[PDB]
Structure formats: structure tokens, C-alpha cells
Amino acid sequence: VLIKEFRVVLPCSVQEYQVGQLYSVAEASKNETGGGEGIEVLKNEPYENDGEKGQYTHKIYHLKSKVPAFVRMIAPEGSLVFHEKAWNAYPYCRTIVTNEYMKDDFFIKIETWHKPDLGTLENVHGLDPNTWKTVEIVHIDIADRSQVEPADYKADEDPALFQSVKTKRGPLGPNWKKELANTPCPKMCAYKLVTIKFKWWGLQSKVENFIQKQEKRIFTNLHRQLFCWIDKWIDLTMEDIRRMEDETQKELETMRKKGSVRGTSAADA
Ligand SMILES: CCCCCCCC/C=C\CCCCCCCC(=O)OC[C@H](COP(=O)(O)OCC[N+](C)(C)C)OC(=O)CCCCCCC/C=C\CCCCCCCC
Incomplete structure (x- = not known):
């Protein structure tokens, strides 16, 4: 099992992000779909479990x-299908990814809290104090070119080179974070706690680390992308x-x- 917390600070409010995230996930999903591979949506409806209201989604990847060669080698034919169930009770979300063949020996749990700050909160998910001390904190900077895989880089999706026409949130320079800090402009941070489990003798450490890297x-x-598409979704309503x-x-x-395969690819070449 491997636990990591990814902190994504953004130059937008928690409210705006609710719309932005959904808009971006929808577009990113289409960019990965084609030629037999991609995202399939089975459910996207409201729910009300116990005293909690939210949106439920069931998707299959x-x-x-898209997986590395070594995964195609060990995986039986037709088993590289993954179910993603998410209970989005924004500003809180709980997502779980499973695989039929792996049953209970595999899972990806993503629990996210969206807060109006700049990623300074500690243990927002309130995990056991001792367990929390073993969780690696990863600070994701959408303006940092060094955090981007060369194969994924696209100059037209570089927030360090983009400026919004509708908000004027200009290009994110090296010190945009500290700037935003003293700029009472919208600000927020998604604390994404990712818990991965891949029980398979000989491959557990390798696969769990691989999945965290891919997440x-x-x-x-x-x-x-969300930031660079801000003009596309900034004026949208939840209804749109x-x-x-x-x-x-x-x-x-x-x-x-139809078509051929498109989008992101993972390779342990
Ligand atoms: C033996 C049989 C088993 C063999 C398996 C072993 C090998 C392991 C290899 C792969 C297994 C992992 C597959 C997991 C699939 C990845 C998708 C994922 O993990 O979705 C979760 C993330 C975080 O959840 P969320 O709540 O934040 O967002 C959701 C927004 N809501 C709540 C509104 C819906 O959702 C997002 O960011 C949504 C962003 C949309 C863009 C998706 C991009 C991914 C598509 C293709 C890339 C594939 C690369 C392969 C590596 C996959 C490892 C991750």
C-alpha cells in the first residue's frame, strides 16, 4: 500500500473550480478516447447517501x-478495464478505482478536499497522526516546466505562457504562488490523498510506485490544461x-x- 498527498494550488476560487474541474475532466476524457481505448461513462447522477448530497459517477477506462508493456505481459487478455466510482460531494470527493480480475487485491482511492488557501493545511484528511507522518506530500506547480514529462509538453498548454482573456490572470511566472499569497484574486488548493494497493508478489512496490507516478x-x-482552458469554462453554470x-x-x-488511439500513454520502456 502506498499513500501520497498531492497538493494542487490554483489561481481560481473553490467555487469556480467546481465548474472548471468538471469541464476539464470532460474534455480530457475525450482526448484519451478512440480506437477501442478511452473513457466510458456508465453513470453521472445526483445522490444522497445518509446525510450527504452529491454527484455520483461510474466510468470505465x-x-x-496505454499501459506499459510489462503490464500487458502479466495481465490476462481483456482484463485491462478499470471501473472508477466517484462520490463528488464538492468541496469533498471520494473516488475509487477497481479492476474485476484483481478483485480485492487492487485499488486506487483518491480523496480530495478543496480549500480556499495555498496548500499549507496539514493532514486535512484527518488521518491517524502516525500514519500521516508516513505520507509523502507532493506539491504540484502547474507553472513549473520541470514537473512536466517532455513527451507531454505542449506550448499551447503551458500556463507559464498563457494569459486569460476573460479574467486577465496573466501567464504564471516562477513566483506566481507567493504573489497570489499577498494578492487578496481567487486562490485555492486541491488536497488529493491517493492510496494505492496492488498486491502481487514480486510487483507490489513496482506497480504501486508506477501508479502514483502516473497519478x-x-x-x-x-x-x-484546466488553467489554459479557463476562458472556455469560467463563465459556465453548473447547468451548462x-x-x-x-x-x-x-x-x-x-x-x-472509431479512429485510432489518442492521448496520454505510459511506458516503462
Ligand atoms: C492483472 C489485471 C490488472 C492490471 C493492472 C495493473 C497495472 C496498473 C496500470 C494501470 C492501472 C491504473 C488504472 C487507473 C485509471 C486511471 C484513471 C484515474 O486514476 O482516475 C482518477 C483521477 C483522480 O480522481 P478525481 O476524483 O480527482 O477526478 C475525477 C472527477 N470526478 C470526481 C468529477 C469524476 O481522476 C482524474 O484526474 C480525471 C482526469 C481525466 C483524465 C484521465 C487520464 C487517464 C487516461 C489515460 C492515461 C492512462 C495511463 C496509464 C496509467 C494509469 C495510472 C493512474
Whole structure:
């Protein structure tokens, strides 16, 4: 088992992010879908478990050629399908990724708190004090080029080179964070606690570390994009998002069937 907390500080409010995250996840999902691989949405509906209200989503990721060669080698044919269930009770979210073949020996749990600060809160998820001390804290800086994998870099998705037309939140320079700190502009931080378990003798350490590395990468590219697409979603209402999600669900079903594979790829070459 491996636990890490990823902190993503953004130049936007917690309120704006609720819309921004959904808009960005919808677009990022389409960018990964095609040629038999990609995202499939099974459910996206409201819920009210116990005394909690929120949005529930059930999605399946088809990652045949997106996983590294070593994973295709050990995985039975047709088992590289992953279910992602998420109970989004924004500003809080609980997501769990599972795999049918792995049953209980595999899971990716992502628990996120969205707060109006700059990633200074400690143990926001209130984990056991001693356990918390063994959790690695990863600070994701969407403006830091060094945190981007060369293969993923795109100058048109570089927040360090982009300026919003509708908010004027100019290009994020090296010291944008400290600047924002003393700039009473919207600010927030997503504390994403990721707990990974991959029980498989001989590969546990390797696979758990691999998945954390990939979650880091996915969080990094997604939020860099989220920021650069800010003019696309900054003026949207939750209602426009629910309309977009309905359209997206349908567009995914069709994309996944046609064309070739597109999007992010992982390789332990
Ligand atoms: C033997 C049989 C088993 C073999 C398996 C062993 C090998 C292990 C290899 C792969 C296993 C891991 C697969 C996990 C799939 C990755 C997706 C993921 O982990 O989704 C969770 C993240 C964080 O959850 P969230 O609540 O923050 O967001 C959700 C927003 N809500 C709540 C509104 C819905 O969701 C997001 O960021 C959403 C961002 C959307 C963009 C998705 C990009 C990923 C698509 C392709 C990349 C694939 C690379 C392969 C490596 C995968 C490792 C991660």
C-alpha cells in the first residue's frame, strides 16, 4: 500500500473550480478516447447517501495500449478495464478505482478536499497522526516546466505562457504562488490523498510506485490544461456542465469505436 498527498494550488476560487474541474475532466476524457481505448461513462447522477448530497459517477477506462508493456505481459487478455466510482460531494470527493480480475487485491482511492488557501493545511484528511507522518506530500506547480514529462509538453498548454482573456490572470511566472499569497484574486488548493494497493508478489512496490507516478502526471497535465482552458469554462453554470456531460457521455461512446488511439500513454520502456 502506498499513500501520497498531492497538493494542487490554483489561481481560481473553490467555487469556480467546481465548474472548471468538471469541464476539464470532460474534455480530457475525450482526448484519451478512440480506437477501442478511452473513457466510458456508465453513470453521472445526483445522490444522497445518509446525510450527504452529491454527484455520483461510474466510468470505465479501457487502457490496452496505454499501459506499459510489462503490464500487458502479466495481465490476462481483456482484463485491462478499470471501473472508477466517484462520490463528488464538492468541496469533498471520494473516488475509487477497481479492476474485476484483481478483485480485492487492487485499488486506487483518491480523496480530495478543496480549500480556499495555498496548500499549507496539514493532514486535512484527518488521518491517524502516525500514519500521516508516513505520507509523502507532493506539491504540484502547474507553472513549473520541470514537473512536466517532455513527451507531454505542449506550448499551447503551458500556463507559464498563457494569459486569460476573460479574467486577465496573466501567464504564471516562477513566483506566481507567493504573489497570489499577498494578492487578496481567487486562490485555492486541491488536497488529493491517493492510496494505492496492488498486491502481487514480486510487483507490489513496482506497480504501486508506477501508479502514483502516473497519478502525479495525470493531475499535472489536467490542471495545466484546466488553467489554459479557463476562458472556455469560467463563465459556465453548473447547468451548462450537466448539459455538456450528457453530450460528452454520448460522444465518448462513438469516439471509442472509431479512429485510432489518442492521448496520454505510459511506458516503462
Ligand atoms: C492483472 C489485471 C490488472 C492490471 C493492472 C495493473 C497495472 C496498473 C496500470 C494501470 C492501472 C491504473 C488504472 C487507473 C485509471 C486511471 C484513471 C484515474 O486514476 O482516475 C482518477 C483521477 C483522480 O480522481 P478525481 O476524483 O480527482 O477526478 C475525477 C472527477 N470526478 C470526481 C468529477 C469524476 O481522476 C482524474 O484526474 C480525471 C482526469 C481525466 C483524465 C484521465 C487520464 C487517464 C487516461 C489515460 C492515461 C492512462 C495511463 C496509464 C496509467 C494509469 C495510472 C493512474
